[PDB]
Amino acid sequence: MANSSVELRVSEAYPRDVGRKIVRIDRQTAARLGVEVGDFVKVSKGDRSVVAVVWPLRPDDEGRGIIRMDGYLRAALGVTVGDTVTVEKA
Ligand SMILES: [Zn+2]
Ligand SMILES: [Zn+2]
Ligand SMILES: [Zn+2]
Ligand SMILES: [Zn+2]
Ligand SMILES: [Zn+2]
């Protein structure tokens, strides 16, 4: 079977995550992906992808269907805040 994947809305990084090879998603999404917080995920837009470590979203950001990633990772994928990307176990 293929690994599960989820589409998420691109959101700006928390300030302390800028320049770190980190994306933030919520626990429900990590569970659907079959990963735990702290594992590597692949984030893709079309044929472009990056690999980053999953850190957990803050409580009030859970359930929003978002992924927080800094401008370096957004640029790498050619996406902006408000775009959608796909996330999968790396
Ligand atoms: Zn879709
Ligand atoms: Zn769609
Ligand atoms: Zn593993
Ligand atoms: Zn766009
Ligand atoms: Zn767009």
Question: Are the beta carbons of 76 and 46 closer than 8 angstroms?
Answer: no
- Taken in order of first residue, the domains within the chain and their CATH numbers are 5-89 (2.40.40.20)
Residues facing residue 55 across a β-bridge = 24
Residue 33, SS3 per DSSP: helix
Residue 51 CA to ligand 3 center (angstroms) comes to: 13
Distance between CA atoms of 14 and 49, rounded to whole angstroms?
21
Residue 7 CA to ligand 2 center (angstroms) comes to: 8
Q: What does the block give as tokens for 52?
A: 């980053």
Classify the phi-psi angles of 72: left when phi > 0, otherwise alpha if psi is within -120 to 50, otherwise beta: alpha
Annotated binding site: 7, 83
Q: What does the block give as tokens for 42?
A: 């692949």
Resolution for this model in angstroms, one decimal place? 1.6
Kindly give, in sequence order, each residue whose CB lies less than 8 Å from that of residue 90, ignoring residues fewer than 6 positions away.
Answer: 39, 40, 41, 42, 51
> Quick one: the chain helix, strand, coil %, rounded to 5?
20, 40, 40
Cβ count near 18 (within 10 Å):
13
Residue 52 CA to ligand 3 center (angstroms) comes to: 13
Question: Are the beta carbons of 54 and 72 closer than 8 angstroms?
Answer: no
Residue 66 CA to ligand 5 center (angstroms) comes to: 15
Cβ count near 53 (within 10 Å):
15
Residue 22, SS3 per DSSP: strand
Question: What technique solved it?
Answer: X-ray
